[PDB]
Short mmCIF file of C-alpha atoms in Angstrom, two decimals:
data_model
loop_
_atom_site.label_atom_id
_atom_site.label_comp_id
_atom_site.label_asym_id
_atom_site.label_seq_id
_atom_site.Cartn_x
_atom_site.Cartn_y
_atom_site.Cartn_z
CA UNK A 7 4.05 -28.97 -21.09
CA UNK A 8 6.61 -26.69 -21.93
CA UNK A 9 5.50 -23.25 -23.47
CA UNK A 10 7.13 -22.53 -25.84
CA UNK A 11 8.15 -26.40 -27.98
CA UNK A 12 10.17 -24.61 -31.30
CA UNK A 13 12.69 -21.55 -31.50
CA UNK A 14 13.52 -19.79 -34.59
CA UNK A 15 16.59 -18.54 -33.82
CA UNK A 16 17.70 -15.03 -35.69
CA UNK A 17 21.39 -14.84 -37.32
CA UNK A 18 21.41 -11.21 -38.12
CA UNK A 19 21.96 -8.30 -35.97
CA UNK A 20 25.02 -8.32 -33.24
CA UNK A 21 23.81 -11.67 -31.99
CA UNK A 22 27.24 -13.44 -31.92
CA UNK A 23 29.27 -10.18 -31.60
CA UNK A 24 32.28 -10.84 -29.73
CA UNK A 25 33.59 -13.68 -27.76
CA UNK A 26 31.36 -13.71 -24.87
CA UNK A 27 27.77 -13.60 -27.80
CA UNK A 28 29.63 -16.52 -29.16
CA UNK A 29 29.83 -18.90 -26.64
CA UNK A 30 26.60 -17.83 -24.45
CA UNK A 31 24.79 -18.84 -28.83
CA UNK A 32 26.93 -21.87 -28.38
CA UNK A 33 25.85 -23.11 -24.64
CA UNK A 34 22.60 -21.75 -25.83
CA UNK A 35 21.82 -23.87 -28.86
CA UNK A 36 23.41 -27.26 -27.16
CA UNK A 37 20.70 -27.13 -24.49
CA UNK A 38 17.77 -26.53 -26.74
CA UNK A 39 19.58 -29.84 -28.64
CA UNK A 40 20.53 -31.58 -25.35
CA UNK A 41 16.98 -31.27 -24.76
CA UNK A 42 15.69 -33.06 -27.71
CA UNK A 43 13.87 -29.36 -29.13
CA UNK A 44 13.57 -28.61 -32.52
CA UNK A 45 15.07 -25.18 -33.92
CA UNK A 46 15.48 -23.19 -37.26
CA UNK A 47 17.66 -20.26 -37.71
CA UNK A 48 16.57 -17.36 -39.46
CA UNK A 49 18.21 -14.61 -42.13
CA UNK A 50 17.59 -12.40 -44.48
CA UNK A 51 21.45 -13.46 -45.88
CA UNK A 52 21.28 -14.05 -49.11
CA UNK A 53 25.20 -13.81 -50.10
CA UNK A 54 25.67 -17.25 -47.77
CA UNK A 55 24.15 -21.03 -48.72
CA UNK A 56 22.35 -22.99 -46.49
CA UNK A 57 26.10 -25.01 -45.98
CA UNK A 58 28.03 -22.35 -45.71
CA UNK A 59 26.40 -20.25 -43.20
CA UNK A 60 25.93 -24.56 -41.22
CA UNK A 61 29.96 -24.54 -41.95
CA UNK A 62 30.35 -21.54 -39.89
CA UNK A 63 28.06 -22.08 -36.85
CA UNK A 64 29.38 -25.02 -36.39
CA UNK A 65 32.77 -24.08 -36.59
CA UNK A 66 32.21 -21.64 -33.80
CA UNK A 67 31.19 -24.73 -31.30
CA UNK A 68 27.23 -23.63 -32.89
CA UNK A 69 25.88 -27.45 -33.53
CA UNK A 70 23.75 -26.59 -37.30
CA UNK A 71 23.03 -28.87 -39.33
CA UNK A 72 22.37 -27.08 -43.80
CA UNK A 73 18.71 -28.35 -43.29
CA UNK A 74 18.57 -25.78 -39.92
CA UNK A 75 19.57 -22.84 -42.01
CA UNK A 76 16.37 -20.72 -43.74
CA UNK A 77 16.93 -17.76 -45.72
CA UNK A 78 14.59 -15.58 -46.63
CA UNK A 79 15.11 -16.27 -50.68
CA UNK A 80 14.20 -19.76 -49.70
CA UNK A 81 10.82 -18.13 -47.95
CA UNK A 82 10.29 -16.61 -51.74
CA UNK A 83 10.93 -19.76 -53.17
CA UNK A 84 8.58 -21.52 -50.99
CA UNK A 85 6.30 -18.76 -50.61
CA UNK A 86 5.58 -18.12 -54.60
CA UNK A 87 5.89 -22.22 -54.90
CA UNK A 88 2.79 -23.10 -52.89
CA UNK A 89 1.21 -19.60 -54.65
CA UNK A 90 1.54 -21.17 -58.09
CA UNK A 91 3.83 -23.86 -58.65
CA UNK A 92 3.35 -23.36 -62.58
CA UNK A 93 3.99 -19.62 -62.39
CA UNK A 94 7.52 -18.82 -64.63
CA UNK A 95 10.07 -17.23 -63.41
CA UNK A 96 12.23 -14.37 -63.79
CA UNK A 97 14.74 -13.07 -61.01
CA UNK A 98 17.44 -11.02 -59.97
CA UNK A 99 19.81 -12.38 -57.90
CA UNK A 100 22.83 -14.61 -56.67
CA UNK A 101 23.25 -18.86 -55.96
CA UNK A 102 21.71 -18.48 -52.50
CA UNK A 103 18.31 -18.06 -54.62
CA UNK A 104 19.05 -19.26 -57.79
CA UNK A 105 19.25 -23.01 -55.75
CA UNK A 106 16.31 -22.24 -53.64
CA UNK A 107 13.84 -22.19 -57.00
CA UNK A 108 15.58 -25.09 -58.31
CA UNK A 109 14.46 -26.65 -55.39
CA UNK A 110 10.89 -25.65 -56.10
CA UNK A 111 11.22 -27.13 -59.47
CA UNK A 112 9.99 -24.11 -61.64
CA UNK A 113 10.38 -22.99 -65.28
CA UNK A 114 12.20 -19.83 -65.99
CA UNK A 115 11.10 -16.87 -68.35
CA UNK A 116 11.96 -13.43 -68.92
CA UNK A 117 9.70 -10.71 -70.59
CA UNK A 118 6.17 -12.72 -70.26
CA UNK A 119 7.40 -13.79 -66.43
CA UNK A 120 4.53 -14.07 -64.04
CA UNK A 121 5.97 -13.25 -61.60
CA UNK A 122 9.51 -11.61 -61.04
CA UNK A 123 11.49 -12.00 -58.19
CA UNK A 124 13.66 -9.45 -57.15
CA UNK A 125 16.77 -10.37 -55.04
CA UNK A 126 20.38 -8.68 -54.43
CA UNK A 127 22.28 -9.77 -57.78
CA UNK A 128 26.42 -7.96 -57.34
CA UNK A 129 26.64 -8.00 -60.97
CA UNK A 130 23.44 -6.66 -61.78
CA UNK A 131 23.31 -4.55 -65.31
CA UNK A 132 21.04 -2.95 -67.04
CA UNK A 133 19.42 -5.24 -69.53
CA UNK A 134 18.30 -7.70 -66.57
CA UNK A 135 16.50 -5.04 -64.94
CA UNK A 136 15.16 -4.03 -67.71
CA UNK A 137 13.85 -7.61 -68.34
CA UNK A 138 12.43 -7.25 -64.47
CA UNK A 139 10.40 -3.56 -66.02
CA UNK A 140 9.18 -5.16 -68.72
CA UNK A 141 7.36 -8.07 -66.75
CA UNK A 142 6.11 -6.47 -64.01
CA UNK A 143 4.40 -4.32 -67.25
CA UNK A 144 3.12 -7.87 -68.38
CA UNK A 145 1.76 -8.37 -65.70
CA UNK A 146 3.87 -10.45 -63.24
CA UNK A 147 3.56 -9.85 -60.15
CA UNK A 148 6.47 -8.02 -58.52
CA UNK A 149 8.34 -10.11 -55.26
CA UNK A 150 11.29 -8.67 -53.24
CA UNK A 151 13.29 -10.67 -51.11
CA UNK A 152 14.60 -8.21 -49.17
CA UNK A 153 13.98 -4.59 -48.29
CA UNK A 154 17.25 -3.36 -47.75
CA UNK A 155 18.42 -0.33 -49.18
CA UNK A 156 21.87 -0.30 -48.27
CA UNK A 157 24.91 -3.14 -47.88
CA UNK A 158 27.73 -2.52 -44.99
CA UNK A 159 31.26 -4.20 -46.27
CA UNK A 160 34.11 -2.91 -46.61
CA UNK A 161 34.09 -0.99 -49.17
CA UNK A 162 31.67 0.98 -47.57
CA UNK A 163 27.78 1.08 -48.47
CA UNK A 164 26.68 -0.74 -51.60
CA UNK A 165 23.50 -0.12 -52.49
CA UNK A 166 20.96 -3.52 -51.15
CA UNK A 167 18.00 -5.59 -52.95
CA UNK A 168 15.68 -2.90 -51.37
CA UNK A 169 17.40 -0.26 -53.81
CA UNK A 170 17.04 -2.58 -56.69
CA UNK A 171 13.35 -3.35 -55.55
CA UNK A 172 12.40 0.72 -55.58
CA UNK A 173 13.85 1.13 -58.78
CA UNK A 174 12.10 -1.11 -60.38
CA UNK A 175 8.49 -0.21 -58.32
CA UNK A 176 9.36 3.45 -60.06
CA UNK A 177 9.87 2.66 -63.52
CA UNK A 178 6.28 0.22 -63.95
CA UNK A 179 4.36 2.18 -60.90
CA UNK A 180 3.41 -0.57 -59.21
CA UNK A 181 4.92 -1.80 -55.29
CA UNK A 182 6.06 -5.11 -54.75
CA UNK A 183 5.10 -7.27 -51.55
CA UNK A 184 8.98 -7.81 -49.36
CA UNK A 185 9.15 -11.23 -47.80
CA UNK A 186 12.48 -10.65 -45.70
CA UNK A 187 12.03 -9.38 -42.25
CA UNK A 188 10.88 -6.83 -40.50
CA UNK A 189 7.85 -8.57 -42.75
CA UNK A 190 6.21 -11.39 -40.93
CA UNK A 191 6.58 -13.22 -44.76
CA UNK A 192 9.62 -15.09 -43.68
CA UNK A 193 8.30 -16.17 -40.40
CA UNK A 194 5.33 -17.91 -42.05
CA UNK A 195 7.15 -19.34 -44.21
CA UNK A 196 9.81 -20.44 -41.33
CA UNK A 197 7.33 -22.10 -39.28
CA UNK A 198 5.93 -24.13 -41.56
CA UNK A 199 9.71 -25.54 -41.87
CA UNK A 200 10.22 -25.40 -38.56
CA UNK A 201 6.29 -28.13 -37.87
CA UNK A 202 5.69 -26.01 -35.18
CA UNK A 203 2.57 -24.19 -33.71
CA UNK A 204 2.79 -20.31 -33.82
CA UNK A 205 1.38 -19.82 -30.13
CA UNK A 206 4.16 -22.40 -29.03
CA UNK A 207 7.04 -20.68 -30.92
CA UNK A 208 9.14 -18.00 -30.01
CA UNK A 209 11.50 -16.07 -31.68
CA UNK A 210 15.03 -15.14 -30.57
CA UNK A 211 17.23 -12.09 -31.56
CA UNK A 212 19.15 -9.37 -30.84
CA UNK A 213 17.19 -6.37 -33.21
CA UNK A 214 14.49 -4.88 -32.99
CA UNK A 215 13.37 -2.33 -36.29
CA UNK A 216 14.43 -5.06 -38.65
CA UNK A 217 14.98 -8.65 -36.93
CA UNK A 218 12.43 -9.30 -33.50
CA UNK A 219 9.86 -6.88 -36.03
CA UNK A 220 9.01 -9.49 -38.13
CA UNK A 221 8.33 -12.49 -35.47
CA UNK A 222 5.77 -9.31 -34.06
CA UNK A 223 4.26 -8.94 -36.90
CA UNK A 224 4.10 -12.39 -38.03
CA UNK A 225 2.17 -13.50 -34.59
CA UNK A 226 5.17 -15.07 -32.42
CA UNK A 227 6.35 -14.63 -29.10
CA UNK A 228 10.07 -13.28 -29.12
CA UNK A 229 12.55 -12.79 -26.71
CA UNK A 230 14.86 -9.94 -27.48
CA UNK A 231 18.63 -10.20 -25.99
CA UNK A 232 21.16 -7.98 -25.24
CA UNK A 233 19.15 -4.87 -24.14
CA UNK A 234 19.71 -2.46 -21.64
CA UNK A 235 17.41 0.41 -19.66
CA UNK A 236 17.32 2.63 -22.49
CA UNK A 237 16.84 0.27 -25.07
CA UNK A 238 13.94 -0.72 -23.64
CA UNK A 239 12.79 2.27 -22.26
CA UNK A 240 12.55 3.50 -26.35
CA UNK A 241 10.26 0.52 -27.23
CA UNK A 242 7.33 0.68 -24.66
CA UNK A 243 7.06 3.93 -26.40
CA UNK A 244 6.04 2.02 -29.63
CA UNK A 245 2.84 0.81 -31.15
CA UNK A 246 4.80 -2.88 -30.15
CA UNK A 247 7.21 -4.41 -27.91
CA UNK A 248 9.20 -8.03 -27.58
CA UNK A 249 7.25 -10.36 -25.06
CA UNK A 250 10.45 -11.24 -23.15
CA UNK A 251 13.55 -8.68 -22.73
CA UNK A 252 16.67 -9.35 -21.33
CA UNK A 253 20.81 -8.48 -21.18
CA UNK A 254 21.48 -12.22 -22.20
CA UNK A 255 20.37 -15.95 -23.60
CA UNK A 256 22.25 -16.85 -20.23
CA UNK A 257 20.05 -16.02 -18.80
CA UNK A 258 16.38 -17.21 -20.65
CA UNK A 259 14.99 -20.75 -18.42
CA UNK A 260 12.88 -22.74 -21.27
CA UNK A 261 9.56 -22.02 -20.02
#
């Protein structure tokens, strides 16, 4: 009789920034667990494995298993697989995306690949990018895991996944299909894994532009936390608003 019987919890934005927010997330997730409400965590992150992420969450007293961690690289693999499980894949990426593809049993190829998947690779090279371009010009579909142009690090803002996709897209004059937030594809793929119905599922996050917009676009109800007077006002000016806006996870009632 709950309106919401499945929860997609965002891992990104500033959801877990500082001790108060961590404790709020711990209390919230533990309550979901107590009520036996299924949930999945969703992230664009491509530098950590499901196992690493779950291990970190548990260390923060936020209950999670590796199977509850769902990334944009997993969504990408899964989406492609359902469309053609016999496609030969060329990818640019790291262990996370490689693992997601491995799990789907793909065959891999270079210049005659059927699908080119672009993810972040912090050891990318001219030749790796060139093979992507040649495969696209040989008719490969062009898919990008995420769209981020820059990535904040210790050193500053480094080149992001989306910047590499722009290079390939410009060179080849082919537009990419993007999977990760703020696109809806990641959220449809997450719904598949979570198993609940779209109209009985809610996405919870605290960033609108990148994160909650994905849920909105995917046709899910959304809870945006960590809002204030000014941000609520601002979103009322946009085409789409979150379903609910609150100060804290502590304020959510399990409707």
